[PDB]
Design a protein around this ligand. Structure first.
Ligand code: MG
Ligand code: MG
Ligand code: MG
Ligand code: MG
Ligand code: MG
Ligand code: MG
Ligand code: MG
Ligand code: MG
Lengths: 142, 314, 190, 225, 101, 144, 67
RNA sequence: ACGAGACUCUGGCAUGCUAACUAGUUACGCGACCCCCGAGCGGUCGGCGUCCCCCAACUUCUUAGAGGGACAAGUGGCGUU
């Protein structure tokens, strides 16, 4: 039994989540906790989307552990989703044939492109003369 | 009297197909380099829906991949890129086993020796470097190799004295002697830059081509100009049939086959049915290769496609 | 697999009765999502917000006023509770109720103003389907917001009542009254 | 104890600024151009660049021997760590500070404003500069102040190339009725070496080489050597 | 044989990298064991001031910025060879500190 | 198939641990628990009179997850936003005399011990108790 | 807007005049030739010049140009 | 010819290069706890070794250097084409 594993990262505004995926039985954990114990649970389906789209059969041969850092809660969740999807695709590319990777990538991309491609948006700098990047202080005459 | 008929098409790339490599050991697999920084190993099924599907992607190059060549036993692969480095991959696991560094410009061509113990590489640095398997550049040539870019470098598979042939953008075809690495022969017949040079399996004839559109056949052992065959716009690739005594040239829109005994065209390969797309230029034929079986031509095009042509005997 | 909003509301049975608005309401198979929260970039290009699912558009338009800007999780919760209340009250798919409410709320003919700051004179014009959808969503959210203010009644209940009345066509809803008044003024400005 | 790197670099900058100000006030008459401090653990060397070194050195080296004293007195670091050297500028026409001082001392002698400005402009252009600008502002004639402007050659105003292609100098001169202000701008020429000009070219200047002569091939020739 | 750390601090990166390359090449020409150069995070000091010497006009601000770059090199060697290689290293603008841990 | 603390829901785990500590009866409770508020940004005293047990359970859980926390760290953990009249709100820390007494009481139960580097950490007995509580919580969640 | 300033156009026209043989319809080969023959101190300026050279070569292949 | 553009800093991409105990990852040992109905190639560990006599490898994640990358380049329309 060779030691085959892949580490992939996903990003949101400042949040970075790195998923390590190796041969296993189907364990998926984030920071040591199960997927269903991550907060907030309002956006729980956003975290279960890749599994629901691909099924437990494709995840049944791998163990995945995610470490998240930075950003906010929503950004961390969106980073975790992308890290999971990219890690599974990268594992299938290396240790399975190319056809399975193509199928998985097509299924993921059709539903949502951000599962595999990062969002480049970042906060804009403040400029003097106003509260923020675009807004200006109240002008007065007379 | 043979007709070449399009059999199928392979679609796995996102960029221009730049080189196609075959091997006698494994007839069922092909290796194709492309401009998407990826080298695709194709597994041939010869099925109804798909003639072949991609099997494994070799991705370690930051820039375009220019040339790819398989080893004698078909177990390793060699590749040059525009990032200035060469890569030696294990085809079994799809991992880079060796890296060759030392070029300061894009590496345009790379060639394996007949014993898989010598490696040659020509760069846009106007430099020809000779390396071993371990990755050490044994000898670099700055002896006025070319005043311009070096397009292609090839080894001569002949029982006689080993020979390396190169073509330059300075309109010259140079012939160097192996194991001593000295300039042996110069050939000045072209009007324009050169793209490809190839050697017949006998090791006696060589073909040179470029922008001028004329494929010039020279004699290697004796060192004289033999023939000149007119072609299309630009000659991208030149190949010899291992068992049929043919010369296949890859022009932009079409592919030409010449019989060297009669100097007569055997076939021209091109197809397009849509009338609306006639305004746009047809995709160019970039790469060309013969299967060791001798019955299928593999042609890589600008259209991000690889087309297979089957010989039909009449 | 079958994708259902919030895990329980299917989208296959929903159908749109207006041919004009079919291309601007996204509720169908390729627009079926689990949650009305995607963090998508729909405002980057013109007409791109017609590809945004209509539930997410309602959620976006419910983050008012300025004391509620950016609180999108509370809005998702409000929408979930409102859909639950709608299903309990009517007994049908809340997505169909939302589609009917948006169809009925959108004004069909408007009046464009030519105004010298005090006096204003107007002329009747037509309304594009995208503006119809936008104005319907705005009117529904405004009606729910004004209903919930200074009253012992959850915002979800008020939103459910507004949607039910708008889908029914009853005049008890804010959106229907506003649409009727706008169309009456447009008719009188012919 | 010791201080942090931020404070250390800020202190070095402040020391260099004060040293330059003191040297300017002391050696304006001698065409003082600049100061360069090379710090070595053995000794800290100070190179004084000025048009003429005879006045800076003084007779038998007295005056410079005074300066290296007061510096040691001022900043307090121990004796034997001070050593001043005087080096003449390679080309005095391409230095804006030296030309501003020359114009100031020509005006102080009673020379006409226009004649002195034109002489400085001609000398700068003859030195090899791409262009030059000289502005003199104040009560040149009468109770009402004005400004005279003398320009020649090329000149760039906006962008990053201004930082390394333009040399600027601002000076004040006290005449009987008040202060006159002098501004001098010099545009350096492009020099492949870094001696008298910027090494890098202007960003938008593209130099296309002329192709070499090529012999037209007629007949295929094979040459073996 | 000492574990010796060389810390290089500079304001411009070209001179700093030139000095680091010179030190690495010199040390490796003596067949020594070198670690690094490891680059510390760049420090950015900022001063925001008003342009006007008085309080009249539009409120415009100048943003002055200074950047400090830091490198570390590790050497397993006696003191004498380190001073041999270091003597050449003197460069204008770069502060070199040699310590024995 | 062994349940650990990270597997179960944290709020239910805190409730169960607080109930276990209260039922044990060996926890030491200060005299002034009924007359104090837990921070200076609080307006009122805590609603639940048995708040000391809940705070002790929360502190034990935090020491389980991240060991070596002192009085200042616990004070920062339980800090919150302070509204001050017509001025903008600001972050404010908790009371030190509550955190210190909670830590001392947990040390009196042989569940918390002094850390070598500084602060406090859990004893193997405390870890065993927390894992047992987590197993009970998981069993109760799954059975129902 | 994507209008090219006269610097790019002048450089492209001079390059096409002097080195018409070496150029073609490929942007990347053209940008590799331009850095070989011409001195452009910027990467973006070189890319703009190469991109205009490719367009001008296509126009020349279509037919004669006014310039 | 100046201004505009070009230019400088900044934000996005690199599983390609350079190399790090004042950054880490993975793996392997020790230890604590849980499940004796599945006790295990089991789970959790911001708990301790693995550079410094000898006791692991490697930069994905962190830092910052050198380079690449985008040019309205490809296709289809509209334009004096
Ligand atoms: Mg902000
Ligand atoms: Mg803000
Ligand atoms: Mg209310
Ligand atoms: Mg300009
Ligand atoms: Mg500008
Ligand atoms: Mg808090
Ligand atoms: Mg308040
Ligand atoms: Mg990295």
């Amino acid at each position: 039994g060779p030691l085959q594993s892949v580490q992939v990262f996903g990003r949101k505004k400042t949040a970075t989540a790195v998923a390590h995926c190796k041969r296993g039985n189907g364990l998926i954990k984030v920071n040591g906790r199960p997927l269903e114990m991550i907060e907030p649970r309002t956006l729980q389906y956003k975290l279960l989307e890749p599994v629901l789209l691909l099924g437990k059969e494709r995840f049944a041969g791998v163990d995945i552990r995610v470490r998240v850092k930075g950003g906010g809660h929503v950004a961390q969740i969106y980073a975790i989703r992308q890290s999971i999807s990219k890690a599974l695709v990268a594992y299938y590319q290396k240790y399975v044939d190319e056809a399975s990777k193509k199928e998985i990538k097509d299924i993921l991309i059709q539903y949502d492109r951000t599962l595999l491609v990062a969002d480049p948006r970042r906060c804009e700098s403040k400029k003097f003369g106003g509260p923020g990047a675009r807004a200006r202080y109240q002008k007065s005459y007379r | 009297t043979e007709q070449m008929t399009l059999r199928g098409t392979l679609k796995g790339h996102n960029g221009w197909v730049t080189q196609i490599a075959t091997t006698p050991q494994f007839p069922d697999m092909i290796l194709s380099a492309s401009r998407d920084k990826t080298i695709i190993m194709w597994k041939l099924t010869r099925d109804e829906t798909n003639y072949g599907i991609p099997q494994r992607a070799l991705r370690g190059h930051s820039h375009f991949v220019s040339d790819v060549v398989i080893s004698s036993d078909g177990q390793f692969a060699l590749s040059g890129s525009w990032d200035g480095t060469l890569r030696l991959w294990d085809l079994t696991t799809g991992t880079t086993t060796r890296r060759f560094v030392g070029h300061t410009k894009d590496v345009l061509s790379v060639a394996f020796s007949s014993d898989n113990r010598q490696i040659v590489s020509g760069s846009r640095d106007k430099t020809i470097k000779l390396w071993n398997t371990l990755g050490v550049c044994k000898y670099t040539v700055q002896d006025e190799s070319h005043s311009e870019w070096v397009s292609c470098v090839r080894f001569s598979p002949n029982s006689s004295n080993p020979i390396i042939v190169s073509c330059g953008w300075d309109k010259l075809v140079k012939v160097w002697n192996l194991a001593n690495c000295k300039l042996k022969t110069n050939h000045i017949g072209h009007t324009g830059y050169l793209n490809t040079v190839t050697v017949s399996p006998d090791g006696s004839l060589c073909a040179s081509g470029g922008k001028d559109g004329q494929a010039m056949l020279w004699d290697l052992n004796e060192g004289k100009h033999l023939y000149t065959l007119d072609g299309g716009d630009i000659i991208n690739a030149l190949c010899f049939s291992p068992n049929r005594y043919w010369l296949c040239a890859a022009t932009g829109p079409s592919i030409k086959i010449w019989d060297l005994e009669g100097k007569i065209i055997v076939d021209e390969l091109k197809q397009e049915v849509i009338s609306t797309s006639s305004k746009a230029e047809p995709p160019q034929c970039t790469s060309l290769a013969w299967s060791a079986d001798g019955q299928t031509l593999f042609a890589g095009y600008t259209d991000n496609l690889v087309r297979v042509w089957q010989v039909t005997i009449g | 697999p079958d994708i259902k909003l919030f895990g329980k509301w299917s989208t296959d049975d929903v159908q749109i009765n207006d041919i004009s608005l079919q291309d601007y309401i996204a509720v169908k198979e390729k627009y079926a999502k689990y949650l009305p929260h995607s963090a998508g970039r729909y405002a980057a290009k013109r007409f791109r917000k017609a590809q945004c699912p209509i539930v997410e558009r309602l959620t976006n338009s419910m983050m008012m006023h300025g004391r509620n800007n950016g609180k999108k999780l509370m809005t998702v919760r409000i929408v979930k509770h409102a859909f639950e209340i709608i299903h309990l009250l009517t007994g049908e798919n809340p997505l169909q109720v939302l589609v009917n409410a948006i169809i009925n709320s959108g004004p069909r003919e408007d009046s464009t103003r030519i105004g010298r700051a005090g006096t204003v004179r107007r002329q009747a014009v037509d309304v594009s389907p995208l503006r119809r959808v936008n104005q319907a969503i705005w009117l529904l959210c405004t009606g729910a917001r004004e209903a919930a203010f200074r009253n012992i009644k959850t915002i979800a209940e008020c939103l459910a009542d507004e949607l039910i009345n708008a889908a029914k066509g009853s005049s008890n809803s804010y959106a229907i009254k506003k649409k009727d008044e706008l169309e009456r003024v447009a008719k009188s400005n012919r | 104890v010791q201080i942090s790197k931020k404070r250390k670099f800020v202190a070095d900058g402040i020391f260099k600024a004060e040293l330059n100000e003191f040297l300017t006030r002391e050696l304006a008459e001698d065409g003082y151009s600049g100061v360069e401090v090379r710090v070595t653990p053995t000794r800290t060397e100070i190179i004084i660049l000025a048009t003429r070194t005879q006045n800076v050195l003084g007779e038998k080296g007295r005056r410079i021997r005074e300066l290296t004293a007061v510096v040691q007195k001022r900043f307090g670091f121990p004796e034997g760590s001070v050593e001043l050297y005087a080096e003449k500028v390679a080309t005095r026409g391409l230095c804006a500070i030296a030309q501003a001082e020359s114009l100031r001392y020509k005006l102080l002698g009673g020379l006409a404003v226009r004649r002195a400005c034109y002489g400085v402009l001609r000398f700068i252009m003859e030195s090899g500069a791409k262009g030059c600008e000289v502005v003199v502002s104040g009560k040149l004639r009468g109770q009402r102040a004005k400004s005279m402007k003398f320009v020649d050659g090329l000149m760039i105003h906006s962008g990053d190339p201004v930082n390394y292609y333009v040399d600027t100098a601002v000076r004040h001169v006290l005449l009987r009725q008040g202060v006159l202000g002098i501004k001098v701008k010099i545009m350096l020429p492009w020099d492949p070496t870094g001696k008298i000009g910027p090494k890098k070219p202007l960003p938008d200047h593209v130099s296309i080489v002329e192709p070499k002569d090529e012999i037209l091939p007629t007949t295929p020739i094979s040459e073996q050597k | 044989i000492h574990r010796i750390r060389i810390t290089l601090t500079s304001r411009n990166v070209k001179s700093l990298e030139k000095v680091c390359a010179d030190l690495i090449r010199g040390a490796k020409e003596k067949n020594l064991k070198v670690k690094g150069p490891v680059r510390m995070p760049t420090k950015t000091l900022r001063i925001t001031t008003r342009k006007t010497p008085c309080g009249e006009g539009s409120k415009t601000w100048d943003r002055f910025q200074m950047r400090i770059h830091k490198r570390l090199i590790d050497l397993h060697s006696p003191s004498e060879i380190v001073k041999q290689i270091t003597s050449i290293s003197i460069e204008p603008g770069v502060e070199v500190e040699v310590t024995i841990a | 198939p062994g349940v650990t603390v990270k597997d179960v829901n944290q709020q239910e785990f805190v409730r169960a641990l607080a109930a276990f500590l209260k039922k044990s009866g060996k926890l030491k409770v200060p005299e002034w628990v009924d007359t104090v508020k837990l921070a200076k940004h609080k307006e009122l005293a805590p609603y639940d009179e048995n708040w000391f047990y809940t705070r002790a359970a929360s502190t034990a859980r935090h020491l389980y997850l991240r060991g070596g926390a002192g009085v200042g760290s616990m004070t920062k953990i339980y800090g919150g936003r302070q509204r001050n009249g017509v001025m903008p709100s600001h972050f404010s820390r908790g009371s030190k005399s509550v955190a210190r007494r909670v830590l001392q009481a947990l040390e009196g139960l042989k569940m918390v011990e002094k850390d070598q580097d500084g602060g406090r950490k859990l004893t193997p007995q405390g870890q065993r108790d927390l894992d047992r509580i987590a197993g009970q919580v998981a069993a109760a969640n799954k059975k129902h | 807007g994507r209008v090219r300033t006269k610097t790019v156009k002048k450089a492209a026209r001079v390059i096409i005049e002097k080195y018409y043989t070496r150029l073609g319809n490929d942007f990347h080969t053209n940008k590799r030739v331009c850095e070989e023959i011409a001195i452009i101190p910027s990467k973006k300026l070189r890319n703009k010049i190469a991109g205009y050279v490719t367009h001008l070569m296509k126009r020349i292949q279509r037919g004669p140009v006014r310039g």
